[PDB]
Amino acid sequence: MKPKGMTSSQWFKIQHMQPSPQACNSAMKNINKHTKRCKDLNTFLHEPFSSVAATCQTPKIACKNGDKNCHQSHGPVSLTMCKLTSGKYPNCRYKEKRQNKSYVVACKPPQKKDSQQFHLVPVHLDRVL
Numbered sequence: 001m002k003p004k005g006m007t008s009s010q011w012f013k014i015q016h017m018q019p020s021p022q023a024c025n026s027a028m029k030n031i032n033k034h035t036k037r038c039k040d041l042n043t044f045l046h047e048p049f050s051s052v053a054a055t056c057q058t059p060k061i062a063c064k065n066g067d068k069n070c071h072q073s074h075g076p077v078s079l080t081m082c083k084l085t086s087g088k089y090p091n092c093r094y095k096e097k098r099q100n101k102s103y104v105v106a107c108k109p110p111q112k113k114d115s116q117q118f119h120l121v122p123v124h125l126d127r128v129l
Contacts, residue, residue: 007113009049009121016105016125018044024082024094038084038092043128045103046078049115052122056107063106063126070126073102079128103128 003011014021014030021027021044032038045052056071063070079101082094104126110118 003111003113005113007111007115007121008108008123009053009110009118010113010115012105012123012125013049015042016044017049018046018078018080018096019048024080024096027096028082028084028092028094032089032092036089038087038089040084040092042082042084042094043103043125044080044082044096045105045122045125046080046098047073049122050118052077052105053107053118053120056105056120056122061104061126069106069108070104071107072104072126072129076100076102079103081128099128101129 028042055073058074060068060071081097081099085093085095087093105122106124106126107120108123110121
């Protein structure tokens, strides 16, 4: 039923964590196994989910059309935009591009893995600014 061992922000930290995923090539490899396909593009952020968690506390914005569940960093964060360099789905290699911009990540209540309890863990990534 509901995930396990991979809280919402946890699944998104293996899919969008730059603190030290081991090269987008490998960071994306964990996604090709959970997606059985290489999304072709994957972005990551370089800030501890505890700091990104608090970063996701600044004013939000009507995500869909009034969801108000996104949160843009109050400044430029050393993020990393990885892209699929080439190879295919079972042999796709990515390149990590270290960029610095204020992005927008969405948040949700700590499922069950809750690294601590946050109450708005950094789950999705609305966009990069």
